[PDB]
Amino acid sequence: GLPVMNTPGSNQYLTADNFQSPCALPEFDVTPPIDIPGEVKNMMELAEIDTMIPFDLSATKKNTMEMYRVRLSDKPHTDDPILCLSLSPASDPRLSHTMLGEILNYYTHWAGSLKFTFLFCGSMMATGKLLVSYAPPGADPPKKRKEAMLGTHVIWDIGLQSSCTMVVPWISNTTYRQTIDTEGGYISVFYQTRIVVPLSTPREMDILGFVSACNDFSVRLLRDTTHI
Amino acid sequence: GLPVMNTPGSNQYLTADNFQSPCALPEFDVTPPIDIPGEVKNMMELAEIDTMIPFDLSATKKNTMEMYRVRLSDKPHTDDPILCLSLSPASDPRLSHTMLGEILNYYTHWAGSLKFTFLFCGSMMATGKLLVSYAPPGADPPKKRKEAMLGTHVIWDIGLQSSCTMVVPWISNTTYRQTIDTEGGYISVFYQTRIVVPLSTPREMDILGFVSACNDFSVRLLRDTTHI
Amino acid sequence: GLPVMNTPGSNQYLTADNFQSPCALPEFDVTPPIDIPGEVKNMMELAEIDTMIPFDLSATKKNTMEMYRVRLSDKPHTDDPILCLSLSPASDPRLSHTMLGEILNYYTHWAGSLKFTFLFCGSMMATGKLLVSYAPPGADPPKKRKEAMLGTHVIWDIGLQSSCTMVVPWISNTTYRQTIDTEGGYISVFYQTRIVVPLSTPREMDILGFVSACNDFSVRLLRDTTHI
Amino acid sequence: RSRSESSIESFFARGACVTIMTVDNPASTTNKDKLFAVWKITYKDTVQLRRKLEFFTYSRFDMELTFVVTANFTETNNGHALNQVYQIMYVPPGAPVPEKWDDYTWQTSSNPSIFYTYGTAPARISVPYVGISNAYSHFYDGFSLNDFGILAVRVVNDHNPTKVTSKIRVYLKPKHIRVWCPRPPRAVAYY
């Protein structure tokens, strides 16, 4: 009847396509779905959940709660960072294992703003001030508190607020960061002042760190790799 | 379902065709493009750019700046042309290597108006008059200044304007000139008067020549040949 | 997608069909055509052109101007026709070679009205009367002038009008005449009176004959045969 | 006169075989590596296309790829076989490329794939512009060339005891092109 011409591309299965397929149970009525609470509509809405960053990946400390706290102490008051942290959400083992990172693993380009958090979880009576600094990419992580105070940085008073939060900003020439290897910036924490305390209270506080995506974050070009 | 008949031509790949093909990344969002300045929309908009004509293709002078100037001198005042030039944009090595020519190379018929230019680039104090003549096709290039003055020709005073421009007109019976071999016309330059000068200023001026297409120019039936 | 069924007839090349075929130069712009004068729109508009009828196909007289004139003479005044002529535009060698016939050759049925002409081309002073008679088909060509005068017939006076024209009419039971073998009618010319002349003027006049189709003529079912 | 035949498209838009991927049926006998063939889509081999592109500095273009496959038995022997089927994998930029014949990559969900059964309408897909930047570049004046993915082909019928070599011409044809900053063209010679 109607004259037609099959062009090239006919009879090839193309995984990456979708066309109305004939259904194998056309009579069968499907069970209606219910309003189960907690429907996810977009992967980003998981990247948006602040999760813990394994700061210590020392064979010993890893694979146990210990890989998540930072032993804020009161030992010789050195001048290096308390914990430096490169913001290559994918190019860094520390950040790689996070949830954010887990979703990033399934994509090649992603580009947004990471927001971090540092919940202090030491004595209620303990008190001090730590300097948290954002070394922007291209540069070098600061090694002295001084250098870091010159840069951007919060001066977070332990005693006043148990948690310093802070959204690092989005940047990239190539307006989509590549997950693979090589920049991204850093985040360090400096003892600004020692963590002074009243009575026998231990001189061993700890700090937890979070990370997540902000609304501006997004990913593109999916790429699963998981195999065996 | 709908009865159909596959006519001849089905299942043949025809390089020269275009049909909506199934896309391999239907989910993938493409990077939006920016307003990069200098977008070209049509090849002609390159043919429209006056470029330099290698007047001398002598093995020696060629493949170096020297293949582009004309040694206007003050030696025995001969009566031949200073530089004759056949306007076969493709059938002539001199004009072949130009940009115009480069685009012409990718087509069989083209048909418009070439506009030439002769920028004199000798002393500011130097002065003279050269006769530039358009011998139309079919005829023979003029060999004496006299014959050329009878034809069409500008009398371009060096001293008054450093550059004689002049659009040669479009002609052809076969209202599309064929790039291959055999007419097209000529363009000669005659010393009209010697190039007189004041003091030790050298008696060696030079002249540059340009060529390009005018709005009426166009090409048709593409034909790439480049191989190895 | 859309469910379809290829019916019989698919993938067969059928010379006698026409379907939009993919074009091999979709970018290529065609040269616009001009108003060349003398565009033909229908083959009939050639059959409509009176051409000459080779009355004599005698090996000798043929293949030279001689195959077209009739030696009207002034020899023994016999009583047969001057030139009988069967109107089988195709079934008769004489009429076959004409232009009309040439187009008829490319068809099986045709059916219209032939119009003939007899341009006398003898002395300006010569004079006489010839009887031209249309023997309709089925009958027999007339052999005496008398019989022919009983039939339809013009009495054409040489002296008054140098040319007798006359449209023979269309007929056929089978309302489309078949070109092959067997009727069609005849056309004869009788000396009605001798062709009397003044002085030494020669007693050898001549007459030319034309034939062509009228508006009612048409052909159907094409059939080329030309081979080797 | 009209300009149409020389617009950017009419110029660039033209099917041009850019390569011939060749593979061999997994003849368990002695087939070494011809098992699969893989090619990183790059213009840089077809002088023709290459040249037309270098006429500019920047450009964007949805590339469409057709596939023409051609087989034949290597041994004049009573070569029998059932219509084979080729797998055509497109590997988008920055994705792992198969190594083994049976490397997990063929299975990996990311990669759009094609199963073309021999002797049928030529296969075809069309990746859209995939530059990470805003246009593919043709020249660069900086330090650490762009990608357009990888094609990968492998026969799928396995224990065939008759070697069946097969070429696969790829006919890439730029579509929806747009260019920037024309540059003088390189002499035919250097390539």
UniProtKB/Swiss-Prot annotation, chain D:
Protein name, as recorded: Capsid protein VP1
Species of the source: Poliovirus type 1 (strain Mahoney)
Cell location: Virion; Host cytoplasm
Biological function: Forms an icosahedral capsid of pseudo T=3 symmetry with capsid proteins VP2 and VP3. The capsid is 300 Angstroms in diameter, composed of 60 copies of each capsid protein and enclosing the viral positive strand RNA genome. Capsid protein VP1 mainly forms the vertices of the capsid. Capsid protein VP1 interacts with host cell receptor PVR to provide virion attachment to target host epithelial cells.
Subunit (UniProt): Interacts with capsid protein VP0, and capsid protein VP3 to form heterotrimeric protomers. Five protomers subsequently associate to form pentamers which serve as building blocks for the capsid. Interacts with capsid protein VP2, capsid protein VP3 and capsid protein VP4 following cleavage of capsid protein VP0. Interacts with human PVR.
Domain of life: Viruses
Region of the whole protein represented: 649 to 859 of 2209
